[PDB]
Design a binder for this molecule. Structure first.
Ligand SMILES: NC(=O)c1ccc[n+]([C@@H]2O[C@H](COP(=O)([O-])OP(=O)(O)OC[C@H]3O[C@@H](n4cnc5c(N)ncnc54)[C@H](O)[C@@H]3O)[C@@H](O)[C@H]2O)c1
Ligand SMILES: NC(=O)c1ccc[n+]([C@@H]2O[C@H](COP(=O)([O-])OP(=O)(O)OC[C@H]3O[C@@H](n4cnc5c(N)ncnc54)[C@H](O)[C@@H]3O)[C@@H](O)[C@H]2O)c1
Lengths: 320, 320
C-alpha cells in the first residue's frame, strides 16, 4: 500500500527491515536533488539522514506525503514551515544516545589531557624526544566545568567526579542544586566562576535563544589560558569566529569539537588549521547501539502516522 | 661536600631543589658522551633520566660515585653489572605513577573505540562524510581483557567495569579470584579465553621471562579481528615484528602503544606506517604529579646513600 523513501540510510538496518515488512521502501544515498524529486513524488513517509536537507520544492512535489522523520534530534535541515503548511507531520528521534555521547565526551576530555594526537604525530615523525618538552595532564583533582546538567551533562559529571576524581562544577539555570549533589558535582549560578575555575569546559546545554553563541569571545577571555573546550552539544552554542580567535591568540589551550555551525562544515573551515583542535564528524551520538534505538524509533513513528496513531515526538503538533 | 650529576632533568624541579640544599648539583641535558665523561669524574651521586644509558666507561671514570638513581622503574639502560662490580648502589623509583598510567590507558582505550585520530584527520581533510562509512564503538557491554591484575591493571579494571559498564576479564597467574571480584572483573586461568573473548586487550604485567614476548603471532591469531591491543606495560611484552604482521594482515583492528622495544625506538620503526596504531613516547607514567613523586623519591634515595642510610629501592642489594 504505502511507499516510504529513505533519504540516506538509517544508522542501523533494523529500522529499514521493520519498515519493509509493512511498506514499500526505497533507499537513496547521498542523492542529487533530481533523485529526491523523482523518488519523493508518491511516497507516504520520508526518513532523512542528518544533516541532509529536505526543502520546500521537494515537499511540494511529495503529493502523498504524510510524515517526515529525522534520524536524530536535529530538525534544522528540514523546511518544517513548508511541511506544516501542507499538514505533514514532522517527528524527530531524541534522547536515545545518552551513553554514546557520554563516552565520546570522556574520550575527548582524556585525549586533550593526554595530548593524544600531538604526541602520536611526534612519535611517528621520529620525535620520541618530545617527551623532554611535553607532559600529559593528570585529570585527578582538576576542575571540569559542565554547561548544562541534563541527561548527558549529568552522566559525564558522574563519571568524571567519581571514577576520574575530578572536581566538577555545573552551570544550568533550570535545575536544583540537589541535582548536582546527586552526581558529586557543585551547581554554580555564576557562569563566570565556572569559566575562571575550570581546567576543562564541556558543553551539554539544550540549544535555545539563551545558549545560542553563549560561548563567544568574552567567555573565552575569562577561561584559563591552560583550559580546554569540549563541544558535543550543538554547533550554535559556540560563536565559531570567536573560537578561531581564542585558539589563534592562545586565550585557551585547545578544543575538541563534534558539532558544527553550519552543519555540514565547509571544506575550508578556519579551525582545521590548528593542531590543538580535534574533530569528529557529528558522531558522538552514533554508535551501533544508539543507531539501532534511533532507527527503530524513526521506523515506528512513520508507521504510527501511516496508521493514524499519534507518534511521541511530533515537532509541529498543530498539524495533528 | 658531595657533588651530584643529573644526566637529564628530573620530571619535576622539586627534586633538583631538594638535592641542591644538601649537595652541589650539575644538570646536563641530552648530553654527548664526552660531557658525561667530564661531568661524572668526581660526583658522589648520579641521576639518569630514562631512557638515557649509563655505561661501563662512564661508571669506570666516576671515581667517587656511590649511588645511581634512575628516574622511574626501568633500569635496563644502566650497566648494573659494572656498578655492582665497583660497589655502587643502584636504586630505581617504582610504583609512583599508578593513577597516571591508569588515566593514560583509559585515554587509549577510548581513543581506539571512538576512532579519534582517524576521524580527526578525515574532518580536517574535508571528509566529514566519512560519517556514512565509519561509526564509533560503544564501550558499554564490550569485553576488556586485562593481562596483569596488579596496581595499574586493577585500577583500569575497576573504572572500566563500573564507570564504563564493560565486561572485564583478567589473566594473572599469581592472584586469587577474589582480587578480580573486588574490581568487578572475572579472573580467567586460560589466556586463550581472554584472547578469544576480548574486544580490547590491555597489557599491565610485570616483565618477566614468562611475560617476555607473550604477545607474539600465535596470540594475535587468537584475538578477535575486530579487537584492539593497548600496551602501557613494557615493550618486551610484545614481539614487535609479530605486531607488525598482525596489523598489516588485519589479524587485529589496531593498537595503542606507549612502550617500545628497544627504547628509544628507531626513527624508522615499521609500526609508524599504520594509521590504526597510535603512539605516545613512554609518557603514561609522567604527569607532573607522578613526576614530582618520582623526583622526590630519587632525590631522597641519593641523599640516603650519601649519609650511609639504606634506601628503599636498591636494585643490587648485594653491594650494601
Ligand atoms: N553530538 C551529538 O551527536 C548529540 C547527540 C545527542 C544530543 N546532543 C546534544 O547534546 C546536548 C545535551 O543533550 P541532553 O540529552 O543531555 O539534553 P537535556 O535536555 O537532557 O539537557 C539539556 C540541559 O541544558 C540545560 N540548559 C538550558 N538552558 C541552559 C543555559 N542557559 N545554560 C546552561 N544550561 C542550560 C537544560 O536546563 C538541561 O538541563 C543537547 O544540545 C543535545 O541536542 C548531541
Ligand atoms: N608506561 C609507563 O610509563 C609505566 C609506568 C609505570 C609502570 N609501567 C609498567 O606497567 C606495568 C604494570 O605496572 P604495575 O605497577 O601495576 O605492576 P604490579 O607489580 O603491581 O603488577 C604486575 C602484575 O603482573 C602480574 N604478572 C606476573 N606474571 C604474569 C603473567 N605471566 N601473566 C599475567 N600477569 C602476570 C603480577 O602477578 C602482577 O599482578 C609494569 O610492567 C610496569 O613496569 C609502565
Amino acid at each position: 500500500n504505502h511507499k516510504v523513501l529513505l533519504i540516506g540510510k538509517m544508522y542501523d538496518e533494523i529500522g529499514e527491515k521493520l519498515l519493509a515488512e509493512y511498506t514499500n521502501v526505497e533507499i537513496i544515498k547521498e542523492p542529487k536533488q533530481h533523485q529526491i524529486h523523482e523518488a519523493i513524488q508518491d511516497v507516504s513517509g520520508v526518513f532523512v539522514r542528518y544533516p541532509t536537507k529536505l526543502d520546500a520544492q521537494a515537499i511540494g512535489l511529495a503529493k502523498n506525503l504524510k510524515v517526515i522523520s529525522t534520524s536524530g534530534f536535529g530538525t534544522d535541515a528540514i523546511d518544517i514551515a513548508a511541511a506544516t503548511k501542507r499538514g505533514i507531520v514532522v517527528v524527530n528521534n531524541p534522547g536515545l544516545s545518552t551513553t554514546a555521547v557520554t563516552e565520546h565526551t570522556l574520550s575527548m576530555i582524556l585525549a586533550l589531557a593526554k595530548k593524544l594526537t600531538f604526541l602520536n604525530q611526534c612519535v611517528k615523525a621520529g620525535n620520541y624526544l618530545i617527551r623532554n618538552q611535553v607532559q600529559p595532564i593528570q585529570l585527578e583533582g582538576k576542575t571540569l566545568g559542565i554547561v548544562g546538567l541534563g541527561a548527558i551533562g549529568s552522566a559525564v559529571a558522574k563519571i568524571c567526579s567519581t571514577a576520574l576524581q575530578m572536581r566538577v562544577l555545573a552551570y544550568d539555570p533550570y535545575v536544583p542544586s540537589g541535582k548536582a549533589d546527586t552526581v558529586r558535582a557543585t551547581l554554580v549560578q555564576d557562569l563566570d566562576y565556572l569559566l575562571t575555575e575550570s581546567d576543562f569546559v564541556s558543553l551539554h546545554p539544550e540549544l535555545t535563544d539563551e545558549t545560542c553563541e553563549m560561548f563567544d569571545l568574552e567567555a573565552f577571555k575569562k577561561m584559563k589560558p591552560s583550559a580546554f573546550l569540549i563541544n558535543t552539544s550543538r554547533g550554535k552554542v559556540v560563536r565559531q569566529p570567536d573560537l578561531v580567535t581564542a585558539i589563534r591568540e592562545k586565550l585557551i589551550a585547545g578544543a575538541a569539537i563534534d558539532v558544527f555551525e553550519p552543519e555540514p562544515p565547509a571544506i575550508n573551515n578556519p579551525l582545521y588549521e590548528f593542531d590543538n583542535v580535534i574533530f569528529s564528524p557529528h558522531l558522538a551520538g552514533v554508535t551501533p547501539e544508539a543507531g539501532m534505538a534511533a532507527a527503530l524509533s524513526a521506523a515506528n513513528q512513520i508507521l504510527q502516522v501511516l496508521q493514524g496513531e499519534k507518534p511521541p515526538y511530533i515537532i509541529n503538533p498543530k498539524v495533528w
